[PDB]
């Protein structure tokens, strides 16, 4: 819900910048001279930035030394069919690259195997000026590096086709990270329109970083492989560590926990990592079922939670959810719902970007009169 709080960046802003340097006179000639005898080199551009340059394909050599010499000029007839096949192979990759660029207007993400093969990407990772821990982390999870990379078309001139590959840099690794799932808490009264609710809006990923917490509201952007979470710091907010206190005490005096308020009580399920939260309201029938014993639990009105140890599916109304069967340990902390604390008569509804202190101020401003 807090994705509107994020700032606006430019992902390719760096890469395009290098692309621009590539249009300056002499730069293509410099890169060409550097790769004259080698397929990998380090080149310092006019602005002084040092970049790794690689020659992945050499069509010039094949075309000018293995195709033209073997064809006659009087009644041309190629001696061998295999040559044709070889040409079709060698050109194929180039064609594919062009196709992708034409589809993506010169900026393609994720980077495909035509732009940068697995071996070339691994070699680039090995040659990057980073620590060995980062090299090991990204040498693995190569698919995530591909999904977080960009490919920018830069220039085609002086018989050289150059494009720019923009790879991620993970400066923060192995720090503790956790995920917060929130569902709605409504007072399960009988009358349809007499119910007031609250939901916490701070759902998403949190990660320790340099003494603060990086908060990613769109948990869909973050990619989870095993217990590793790859997240883009661009779509994040820097918060004090005290935000974690909101998990153990929503009314703690150190941090003001963000919440929303409403009068609509609909039943829904949030499938968490090790279980499922079920908010059952109204006449909706909510159950938890196992593939062997069938229905094993029936939820009453309110908010409940079931782990995935014995539960395989959860049915809320006409919806059926499959729970994640990832191994782990779940704990249930019993407590009085905080929704019951509020007086429905003076409860402020239809508040989206609010918090517990802001809701208290709103209630106290309704008791300004009277």
């Amino acid at each position, epitope marked *: 819900f807090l994705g509107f709080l994020l700032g606006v960046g430019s992902a390719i802003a760096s890469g395009v910048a290098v692309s621009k340097v590539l249009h300056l006179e002499g730069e293509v000639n410099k890169i060409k001279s550097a790769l004259l005898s080698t397929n990998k080199a380090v080149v310092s551009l006019s602005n002084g930035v040092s970049v790794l340059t690689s020659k992945v394909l050499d069509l010039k050599n094949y075309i000018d030394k293995q195709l033209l010499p073997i064809v006659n000029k009087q009644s041309c007839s190629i001696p061998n069919i295999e040559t044709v096949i070889e040409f079709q192979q060698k050109n194929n990759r180039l064609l594919e690259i062009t196709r992708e660029f034409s589809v993506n207007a010169g900026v393609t993400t994720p980077v495909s195997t035509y732009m940068l093969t697995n071996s070339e990407l691994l070699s680039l990772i090995n040659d990057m000026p980073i620590t060995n821990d980062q090299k090991k982390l990204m040498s693995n999870n190569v698919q995530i590096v591909r999904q977080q990379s960009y490919s920018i078309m830069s220039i085609i001139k002086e018989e050289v086709l150059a494009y720019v590959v923009q790879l991620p840099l993970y400066g923060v690794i192995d720090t503790p990270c956790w995920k917060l799932h929130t569902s709605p808490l409504c007072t399960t009264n009988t009358k349809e329109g007499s119910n007031i609710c609250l939901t916490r809006t701070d759902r998403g990923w949190y990660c320790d970083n340099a003494g603060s917490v990086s908060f990613f509201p769109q948990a869909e952007t973050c990619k989870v492989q095993s217990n590793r979470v790859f997240c883009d710091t661009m779509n994040s907010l820097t918060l004090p560590s005290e935000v974690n206190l909101c998990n153990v005490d929503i009314f703690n005096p150190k941090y003001d926990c963000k919440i929303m308020t409403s009068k609509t009580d609909v039943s829904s399920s949030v499938i968490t990592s090790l279980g499922a939260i079920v908010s059952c309201y109204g006449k909706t029938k909510c159950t938890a079922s196992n593939k062997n014993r069938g229905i094993i639990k029936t939820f009453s009105n309110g908010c409940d939670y079931v782990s995935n140890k014995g539960v395989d599916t959860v049915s809320v109304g006409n919806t059926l959810y499959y729970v994640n069967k990832q191994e782990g340990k779940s704990l249930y902390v019993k*407590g*009085e719902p905080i929704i019951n*604390f509020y007086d429905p*008569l003076v409860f402020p509804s239809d508040e989206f970007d609010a918090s517990i202190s802001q809701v*208290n101020e709103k*209630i106290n401003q309704s008791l300004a009169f009277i």
Partner: antibody, heavy 125, light 113 residues
Framework: QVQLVQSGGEVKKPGASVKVSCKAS????????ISWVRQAPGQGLEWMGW????????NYEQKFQGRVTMTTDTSTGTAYMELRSLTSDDTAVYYC??????????????????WGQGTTVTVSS | DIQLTQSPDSLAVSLGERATINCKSS????????????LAWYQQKPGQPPKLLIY???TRQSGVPDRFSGSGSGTDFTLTISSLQAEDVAVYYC?????????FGGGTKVDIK
């Protein structure tokens, strides 16, 4: 289970001071206040004071002003009530009761819904 | 302060018969922001702390038997027992939490004839 457990009874001499403990269980201690009620033998309940477990705010009875001190220990979740200059009129049973919710403004007030078992204090020679 | 008075001081009711206790306050106990009468009825037995029976104007605490009921408003309130039983022999108090200090009632003792 929401409950309050108080310390055992005490025997004191006049002019001394008495400390009564009240530990809370089954609920978040810092979300509610604690009231202290005194009951003399063969007499009705007498309210002595109320201490907020959230920020330590205290409200004492006018008769007990300057004579009774209430403290809150959030680490152990225990309310302590101390009384000084005991006389032959202090001998009574003291109860700790859970009071209004202090973390939400104008929250639902159902009164003193949870009570302690009671501590008897006898002041005699 | 708001002083509370109870009537009668002592009550004697036969088994299975209605019992009535009246509580009157020197000042109104209505909480204007939520329109609630901040009065509570407790019962106490020998060797036991008071237990909350009625809160607000007329609301029953969870687990309280349905025979106990509250009524009244403004200045006079009433606690009613539909059918007095053996276990209902206790001292009943009315107290107001509208404003500090919390003044409890004088106390009414219920006995079986």
């Amino acid at each position: 289970q929401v409950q309050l457990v108080q310390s055992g009874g005490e025997v004191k001499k006049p002019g001394a001071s008495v400390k009564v403990s009240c530990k809370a269980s089954g609920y978040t201690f810092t979300y509610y206040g604690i009231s202290w009620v005194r009951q003399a033998p063969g007499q009705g309940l007498e309210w002595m004071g109320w201490i907020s477990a959230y920020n330590g705010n205290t409200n004492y009875e006018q008769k007990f002003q300057g004579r009774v001190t209430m403290t809150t220990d959030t680490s152990t979740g225990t309310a302590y009530m101390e009384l000084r200059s005991l006389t032959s009129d202090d001998t009574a049973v003291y109860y700790c009761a859970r009071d209004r919710i202090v973390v939400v403004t104008a929250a639902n007030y159902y009164g003193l819904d949870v009570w302690g078992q009671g501590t008897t204090v006898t002041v005699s020679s | 302060d708001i002083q509370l008075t109870q009537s009668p001081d002592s009550l004697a009711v036969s088994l299975g018969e209605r019992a009535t206790i009246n509580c009157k306050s020197s000042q109104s106990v209505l909480y204007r922001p939520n329109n609630k009468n901040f009065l509570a009825w407790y019962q106490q037995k020998p060797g036991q702390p008071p237990k909350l029976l009625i809160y607000w104007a007329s609301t029953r605490q969870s687990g309280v038997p349905d025979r106990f009921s509250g009524s009244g408003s403004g200045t006079d309130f009433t606690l009613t027992i539909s059918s007095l039983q053996a276990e209902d022999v206790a001292v009943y108090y009315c107290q107001q939490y509208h404003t500090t200090p919390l003044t409890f009632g004088g106390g009414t003792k219920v006995d079986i004839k």
